[PDB]
């Protein structure tokens, strides 16, 4: 009764008792911080203080701009979406301009990409609205019903942008600037 039965009886063996040499090796490992090319994984509290998902968006915007080809931009966008970092106006505009420039891409794919970006959270802006308007104007081969359906979305988006602009310019009493923006709208 002195030595407990649980330490020498094989019937009471612990099924999931790891050995002494395994867990220490498991926790000793320091995996590489370059899980993704653009950013570095933080290993120290200082690196964690510097690290932020929103800040990674700036570096991804820079790398996307440095990329010269739409397939490379798409690969970088896939990496960014897999990382889950924030997607904003800068990446939306730089992606849409190259998608519009590219000819091999169907004009529906760029609209789908814009819709999924605005679903991810990147708020629309006037430059992206202009790019989508250009694609809609250069989408002759597509059905007229499709063009009209996307025209409704474009016009409501422009109305939303105008409302946001007037809301953000009302307090500062910049009547001339507000009129100038609304002339473009």
């Amino acid at each position: 009764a002195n030595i407990p039965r649980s330490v020498w009886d094989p019937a009471q063996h612990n099924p999931n008792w790891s050995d002494s040499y395994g867990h220490d090796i498991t926790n000793r490992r320091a995996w590489p911080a370059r899980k993704w090319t653009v950013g570095l994984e933080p290993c120290t509290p200082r690196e964690w203080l510097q690290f932020s998902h929103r800040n990674l968006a700036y570096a991804y915007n820079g790398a996307l701009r440095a990329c010269h080809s739409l397939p490379s931009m798409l690969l970088l966008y896939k990496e960014m979406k897999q990382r889950g970092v924030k997607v904003d106006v800068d990446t939306m505009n730089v992606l849409l301009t190259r998608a519009a420039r590219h000819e091999h891409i169907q004009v529906d794919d760029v609209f789908l990409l814009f819709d999924e970006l605005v679903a991810l959270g990147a708020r629309p802006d006037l430059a992206a609205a202009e790019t989508l308007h250009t694609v809609l104007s250069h989408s002759a081969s597509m059905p007229e019903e499709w063009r009209e359906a996307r025209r409704l979305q474009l016009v409501e988006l422009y109305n939303n942008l105008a409302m946001e602009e007037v809301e953000r310019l009302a307090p500062h009493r910049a009547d001339r600037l507000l009129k100038e923006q609304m002339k473009r709208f």
Binding site: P10, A11, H13, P15
Partner: peptide, 20 residues
């Protein structure tokens, strides 16, 4: 719930990991 627990652990002098 180890399989063949009686023969492997409580029946074998090697606990199934010793090649006699």
């Amino acid at each position: 719930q180890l399989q063949a627990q009686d023969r492997i652990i409580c029946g074998t002098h090697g606990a199934g990991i010793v090649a006699h």
